[PDB]
Every structure is written in C-alpha cells, then in structure tokens.
Amino acid sequence: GGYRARPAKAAAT
Amino acid sequence: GDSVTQTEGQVTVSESKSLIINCTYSATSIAYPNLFWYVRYPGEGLQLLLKVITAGQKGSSRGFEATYNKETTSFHLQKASVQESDSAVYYCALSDSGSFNKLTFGAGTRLAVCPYIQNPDPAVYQLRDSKSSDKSVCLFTDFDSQTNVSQSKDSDVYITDKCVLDMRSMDFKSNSAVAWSNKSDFACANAFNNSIIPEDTFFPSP
Amino acid sequence: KEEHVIIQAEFYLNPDQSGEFMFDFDGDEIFHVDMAKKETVWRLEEFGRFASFEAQGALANIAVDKANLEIMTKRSNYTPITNVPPEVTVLTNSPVELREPNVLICFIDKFTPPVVNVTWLRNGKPVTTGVSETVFLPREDHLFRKFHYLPFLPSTEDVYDCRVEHWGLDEPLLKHWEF
Amino acid sequence: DTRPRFLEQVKHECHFFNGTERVRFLDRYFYHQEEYVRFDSDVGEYRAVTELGRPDAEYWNSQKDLLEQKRAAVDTYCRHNYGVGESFTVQRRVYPEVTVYPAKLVCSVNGFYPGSIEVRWFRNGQEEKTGVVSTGLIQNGDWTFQTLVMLETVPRSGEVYTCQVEHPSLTSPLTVEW
Amino acid sequence: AVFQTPNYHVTQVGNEVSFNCKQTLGHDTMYWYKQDSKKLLKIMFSYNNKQLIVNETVPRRFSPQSSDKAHLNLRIKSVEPEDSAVYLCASSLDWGGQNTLYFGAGTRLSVLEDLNKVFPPEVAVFEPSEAEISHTQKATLVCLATGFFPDHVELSWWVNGKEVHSGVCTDPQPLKEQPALNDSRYALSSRLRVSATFWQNPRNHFRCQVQFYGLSENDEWTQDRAKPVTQIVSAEAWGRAD
Ligand SMILES: *[C@@H]1O[C@H](CO)[C@@H](O)[C@H](O)[C@H]1NC(C)=O
Ligand SMILES: *[C@@H]1O[C@H](CO)[C@@H](O)[C@H](O)[C@H]1NC(C)=O
C-alpha cells in the first residue's frame, strides 16, 4: 500500500 | 512498465447503437491506480470525459459510463445510445494516485458516429473549376451510411474519405466523397470503381 | 481500533533552510522523509515492508512551504518567531539492572523553533557511539517534541547527562541521571 | 547565532471516530505557531483563522476543482491512509512486560502498544483503594509506551500483592505477584 | 482556461523554438505533453509552483521554464526531426494523481530537414453540377487545397463575406499527393452545400479560404519561388443563373 501525501498549496500572491 | 491498452484505431457506429470502448491497464508498480477517460472533440483540445479514483466505483458523464474494475484491471467505456455529437477521439488514461500526477495514455480510439440517411439519392457528379473548365472533380454524394468509400489504390488518383455535412436550415444531412486526378483516362464513371456503391447510383451523362 | 488521529506535519525554517516532512499516528511517527537522501525513513523498519511512500512528493511540499514562508514572512512585516525554551526529561525505557542492557531517553518537549543541539555526556564527557534521535515531532500546541536515545550498560561508576542547547535558554540545560 | 527565525507549518490532520465511519479532515496552515488558514471538512471550504490567511482562503476556494478535492479528502486522503497503515498502526498490538519491585510495590509496565492500559493493585484479593500513585502514560517515541504505578502500603505477613494489567493486546488480565 | 502559443510552427533542424502556456484556473501544477506523429500521448514535464517535479527522460534539448505557477514555457534548443509533434500544455490543481488535467489547444511543431519542402496551398473551387441541381435542388461546391507542406492549414468557407458552418464538410485529415515520400505535399478537400436557388442567385458569393501556416518574416529564403510564409489562399465563385 502507498501513503498519499496531501499536497501543499501555493499561497496567494 | 505501465501501459494502457484500448480499442485500436477507428470505431464506426450508427447513431442510437450501443458502444463499448475497451480499456485495460498494466500497472505492476502502482498500488492504487486512478483511471480516466479523456475526450478530444473535433477541432477541440483534450478534456476529461470521466474519471474514477476509487477501485470499486463507476464514473459517468455525457451518457458514457466506465467502471474501475481492479479485479480484471479494466476501465471499459460504455454508452447505450451514442449520438452524432459523440464523434471524437477517446483516450484511456492511468495515473498513480500516490505519486506525482503522470498520465499513462492509451493509444486513443477514434469514434465516428454515422447518422442514418433517411432518403438516399446516391449520385456521382462532375464539378468543374470556376476558373478553368478543363479541371474537374468527381463528387459522390447522397449515398446511404452503409456505403464505404474506399481510398484510392492509385497514387495519381485521389479519393477523400466519406464526409457528412449538415445543412441545418433544411435539416438535411448528406454524405459525400470527392475524387480527382490528372490522369487523362480518369472519368467520374470509373472514379469510385474500387468502392461498392449502390446499384441505383445516378451517373449523369456529360 | 476506534478513535485515532493521523497528521501529516510539515515545516520549513528560514534562514536555516531546513524543512521536514513526517506522518504522525496518535503521537507516534509513522515515517519521515530525509530531505538530503530523498528517501522515506520509517520509524520502525518493519513498516517499510507493509506500506510505501513516494518521498518525492514530500520534497515538492517542502518546496511549496519554503516559497509560502517567504510570502507569509512579508505578510507579517517580517515578524519573527519568539523562541520557546524546552522542558527536557531524561528517563529509561526499562527497569534498571546492573549489567543488564538498557537505553537512556532524552525527551525534549515544548520548544520552537525546531533547532536544538543535543549531546549525551557520559562522566561529563560527550558520548556518541550508538546514539540515535528522532526528527522533530509535532505537538497540538504547534511546538515540537524530540527523542534522543543512548543505549548503555548501567554501572555504579558511570554518570550521564543530556546537554540541550536552545535559543530560548539563556544557558545550556543539563538533565542528570545516575544510579 | 543572532539572526531571527521564520517558521512555516502545514498540518493535514485526519480525525477518526469508530475507524473510518466518522472522519473529519483538517488542512491547517501555520506561521510560527499561529494558524492562519484552515479547511475543515465539517465546513466545506477554507476559512481564515486570522487576518494573515484572508488572501489564501479567498484565493484557494476560487481555484478550479479545489472545493471538490478538499471535500473529498476524508475519503481520498484520510480513509485511504487509514487503511494503508491499518495492519501495523490501528491493529498494532505489543504486549506489556511487567515487573514488580520494592519501595515503601512498584509495578513497572514497559514496552506496550497501544497506550490504552489499565493497571490495578490487589492486596491479598481485594483491589487496594488508597496509596496508589501513578507516573502516567509516557510515550517512548518508538511505538512503545511505559508506565509505573506504585502502592504506598505496608507489607503484613505473607500478604500477596498482585498487579493486574488490562491491555488491548491481551484477552485476559495479566497478573504479576510479589 | 489554458492558453498556449504558438498554434503552429515550422522550422529547420538545428533551430531553436519556444512555446508558451498560461492557465487561469489558479492551479499550482502545469505540464508539457508530447503527442507524436502517430498520436501517442506521453508526459514530458511537470512543474509545481515554479519547481520542476517530473522530467520523463526528456532530451536536454528541452528547457522548460516557469517564473510563475500560472505560466509554463518550453524551449527546444536545437530541434531534430523527431521533435515534430503536437505539444500539449496542461494544468492540474496540484500534483496529486487524483486531479483532473486541463489541456490547452496544443502547439503543432513541424521540424524539417529542408525548408525548401515548404509550400503554400493552391486553392480551387469547383462549381455545382448542372445534374445535381436538377436532380436534388441542391448545389455542392467543392474546394481543393493542394500541394501544401507541412499540413498546417485551416479551411473555412465564406458566403457573401461571412463565414458559414452549416452545409460544410471538410476532410478530417489531408491526403498525401505522393504517399511514398515522407516529405509529400498534401491535399485537402471541403464541400459547401446550399440550395440550388441560393447557388443560382448571381448576387451570392462563395469563397473557399485556406489559412496556411508556414515561415515567418524572420526566415531567410534563397529560392526563386516566393517565400512560403504564413498566408491565406482563397478561391471564389459567384452564383450562376444559367
Ligand atoms: C549548535 O552549535 C552550533 C555550533 O557552531 C551553533 O552555531 C548553534 O547556534 C548551536 N545551536 C543552538 C540551538 O544553540
Ligand atoms: C462503528 O462502525 C461499525 C461499522 O463497521 C458499526 O457497526 C457500529 O455500530 C459503529 N459503532 C460502534 C460503537 O461500534
């Protein structure tokens, strides 16, 4: 089984 | 190592017929795949038809349906009643749900949905150039959708595929194919001889 | 098998340019990603044979946090973090018995930013053979924990300390342990 | 070192109640130890926790497919990672090793997992009421717990002191006598 | 949307080309995909927030670039014939495998060994048959675009100065005038069908237009024939009463 990383979101700019 | 195999080539179906587009995947190094159908409508770019991101579920869109069947490693695309507007290229795709998004695409399947021609009037006409009367093309038109136009086997004779035009103000659809050549012995009477055309095809005399 | 919490905790620290990525299950680390080696490091070796994790996605997240940190630093008029000194505790994982193997644990708790120097002092002299440590572990108050381990053989003539250096401490903090 | 520090933190939290039946997902962003944006699966969108997160909440919630993706994270992220590691995290069982040694009666319970544990003192048959001090649950950081629970009670004749340990790794109470 | 540019480009082996892409979805992740001659789709690059995250063993000839997560460019330092392809830009919300990819219209690159192979279409319109008119009360005009290379053409019909789409059928793909040669010039046909009485109105004007994409102003041209630049080639007919 593979863990799924929750992707970090790019902050507003 | 990861591949997606789907119905090869072109699938010609009459409108209102049911359709299956097969798709199986081989992803030995992927724990939990995700499965996608992307569609490219004529003159448009790729877009998602539908996807399934859970190994048991089925996805549906536009009357299409696909079931992520991890048991048989397949994602077949089905529609009970295809319409002319479904003519498109359909791409089966696989991604690894646990890593960066990388679509492994199948080779794509071109669907051509043929309308029914309600009153065929098959004919071969010779059209002349507006600029030079000596240049002509042969127009095969108004034949039923069952008729297959064969490509030319001669390099010096050119025959296009069957084409369906829709005169939308008249609500009139018609098939056509064009043939032309610079050979001296080329006539419209023998232009489509390598095709099986209706016996009642009109050949007007020049 | 009833009530659990799984936390994916990431951080990035300027100007030290150190980021970390780990998975926490009920206060225990499932794994972390070693940014240098770009590898997934399971807290227990056995875990790596029952699950997998593509560590590249952790590095992509750290990149995004590094970029967001600069953005968030500007949104705060470059408001820095206020150091929080750690409460450190030295203990053993087993009852102590002479000539019976044991491990010393140094639990550094309730601190930020995640930068510490930890040195085990045997008889006041630094000891390094056999040492191990965990990555910075998240807390509910969003400070950090950390475990340092020293396997040893208890004796009457050996005294041990855990030397902890943190920017919140005005002086390095020693936690003693004897028998 | 003198120069100031700046810390960004992201915590993607998965809260499980009765396994994967009731799952709450929290996407939490932090500046130092200050949470500024949060997606709460019970809310369904990003919300600013402070002013510092106002542009992120507005920007992110507007992104194409963002709300759909985050609203699905309880299934695609939380329930998934739960089952991926279930056999060695939720189902992890390491039985405790118990030792009972003297002091004005120290029941040392070491090396167990999970941390839900009950230990109760028994003096010749009845469970002792007073004099029971407990060091509390302490986490060794290696997926093992330990705890020491002592008894302040005088030894009489040949009174049997029993430390009964009840742990989810054991079908029946573990009893050690002194 | 996902906007990319250029739509068509033709250039000689050894030259440099740059493609550009923009997405307005607010997405963090963007992609280059190559659709080769036989229409096979393969990922090339993935960028996440200006950082390259996947490189599917792409030749170093290719240099992607992103100074903003909405923008992704592709420079091919010194194109080779195998680079002829459609290059598709895509974006996704983030790098997760579960995300939908949103694709752009594509950049059709044609890399040629010799720009002397580039030819614009010759366009001719063939007037409806007398027999078709009296047999069906309909009138089909046929447009032939011939002798062009590469196959970077867009055909359109114009009736009385206005583009029409009703009544029109254009071949989905051009045919090769000489299938033997891989450098073969192409031919394309289109039909425009109208009522016979519309064709029989001499006040009606029918034009077949072929937008050809060829060389630009920059390209040097040694040959005596006209430089085969991007251009429109049209052919026309007016209605005929008799
Ligand atoms: C750890 O030691 C190094 C040695 O140069 C020092 O620069 C650094 O400040 C120390 N860390 C802390 C937290 O004091
Ligand atoms: C927990 O979930 C199960 C489903 O597996 C259900 O049968 C049960 O009623 C729920 N509640 C408790 C207290 O177990």
**Both structure tokens of E188:** 């394309």
> Residues with Cβ within 6 A of ligand 2?
D 18, 21
Q: Are residues C70 and C87 in the same domain?
A: no
Q: Are residues E134 and E239 in the same domain?
A: yes
Sort C45 into a burial class: Cβ within 10 Å, 0-12 / 13-18 / 19+: exposed
CB E234 within 8 A of CB E155: no
- d(Cα E38, Cα E58) in Å, to the nearest integer? 18
CA E175 from centre of chain: 15
**Both structure tokens of C122:** 């045997």
Q: Are residues C99 and C163 in the same domain?
A: yes
B184: Cβ contacts below 8 Å, ≥ 6 apart = none
Among C16, C22, C26, the residue to mutate for chain D (most D Cβ within 10 A): C26
Q: Are residues E41 and E87 in the same domain?
A: yes
Final residue in a domain of this structure, among E83, E98, E113: E113
Q: Are residues C89 and C68 in the same domain?
A: no
Mapping DSSP to helix (H, G, I), strand (E, B) and coil, where does residue B52 land? strand
**Residue C105: Cβ within 10 Å count:** 20
Establish if D63 touches chain E: CB-CB under 8 angstroms: yes
Determine the straight-line distance between the first and last CA of chain D, rounded to whole angstroms.
55
Final residue in a domain of this structure, among C28, C61, C80: C80
Q: Are residues C16 and C53 in the same domain?
A: yes
DSSP B62: T
Phi, psi of C17 (to 5 degrees): 50, 45
Mapping DSSP to helix (H, G, I), strand (E, B) and coil, where does residue D82 land? helix
Q: Which residue of E has its CA nearest to D56?
A: E26
Q: To 5 degrees, how large is the angle CA B30–CA B33–CA B37?
A: 140
Measured in Å, residue D166 CA sits from the centre of ligand 2 at 23
Beta bridge partners of B82: none
**Both structure tokens of B146:** 């069952």
Q: How many domains does one find in chain E?
A: 2
Q: Are residues E118 and E173 in the same domain?
A: yes
Q: Confirm or reject: Cβ of C116 under 6 Å from ligand 1.
A: yes
Beta bridge partners of D6: C14
Q: How many domains does one find in chain C?
A: 2
Residue C58's nearest CA partner among C8, C16, C5, C7 is C8
- d(Cα C37, Cα B28) in Å, to the nearest integer? 25
Mapping DSSP to helix (H, G, I), strand (E, B) and coil, where does residue E13 land? coil
Establish if E55 touches chain C: CB-CB under 8 angstroms: no
Residue type, B67: T
Beta bridge partners of D98: D109
Q: Are residues E118 and E104 in the same domain?
A: no
Give the 3-state DSSP-derived string for chain C, with helices as H, strands as E and coil as C. CCEEEEEEEEEEEECCCEEEEEEEECCEEEEEEECCCCEEEECCHHHHHCCECCCHHHHHHHHHHHHHHHHHHHHCCCCCCCCECCEEEEEECCCCCCCCCEEEEEEEEEEECCCCEEEEEECCEEECCCCEECCCEECCCCCEEEEEEEEECCCCCCCEEEEEECCCCCCCEEEEECC
Q: Do B32 and D76 touch (CB under 8 A)?
A: no
- d(Cα B183, Cα D156) in Å, to the nearest integer? 124
Q: Are residues E102 and E168 in the same domain?
A: no
- Residue E239: domain span: 114-242
Q: Do B31 and A2 touch (CB under 8 A)?
A: yes
Final residue in a domain of this structure, among E94, E113, E132: E113
CA E94 from centre of chain: 30
Can you spell out the DSSP letters for D23-61? EEEEEEEEETTEEEEEEETTT-SEEESSGGGHHHHHHHH
Q: Do E93 and D66 touch (CB under 8 A)?
A: yes
Q: Are residues E206 and E141 in the same domain?
A: yes
Helices (H) and strands (E) in chain D, counts: 4, 13
CB C163 within 8 A of CB C121: yes
B51: Cβ contacts below 8 Å, ≥ 6 apart = B34, B35, B36, B37, B59, E100
Note the resolution in Å, 1 decimal: 2.3
Q: Are residues E77 and E171 in the same domain?
A: no
Phi, psi of B147 (to 5 degrees): -75, 130
Final residue in a domain of this structure, among C80, C113, C133: C80
E117: Cβ contacts below 8 Å, ≥ 6 apart = E149, E183
Method by which the coordinates were obtained = X-ray
What residue segments make up the domains of chain B, in order of their start? 1-114, 115-206
Parallel, antiparallel or unpaired: strands B9-14 and B109-114: parallel
- d(Cα C4, Cα D82) in Å, to the nearest integer? 9
- d(Cα C145, Cα C143) in Å, to the nearest integer? 7
CB B163 within 8 A of CB E169: yes
CB C114 within 8 A of CB D32: no
Contacts 24+ apart (CB under 8 A), B161-167: B161/E171, B161/E172, B163/E169, B163/E170, B163/E171, B163/E191, B164/B84, B164/B114, B164/B115, B164/E169, B165/E167, B165/E168, B165/E169, B165/E191, B165/E193, B166/E166, B166/E167, B167/E138, B167/E166, B167/E167, B167/E193, B167/E194
Final residue in a domain of this structure, among C80, C108, C134: C80
- Residue C108: domain span: 81-179
Q: Do A10 and C23 touch (CB under 8 A)?
A: no
Q: Confirm or reject: Cβ of C17 under 6 Å from ligand 1.
A: no
Q: Are residues C57 and C144 in the same domain?
A: no
Q: Which residues of E69-86 are buried (b: 16+ CB within 10 A; e: fewer)?
A: bbbbbbebeebeeebbbb
Nearest CB among A3, A9, A12 relative to D81 is that of A3
| Residue written as token pair 């012995």 | B185
Q: Are residues E17 and E108 in the same domain?
A: yes
CB B168 within 8 A of CB E166: yes
Final residue in a domain of this structure, among E98, E113, E128: E113
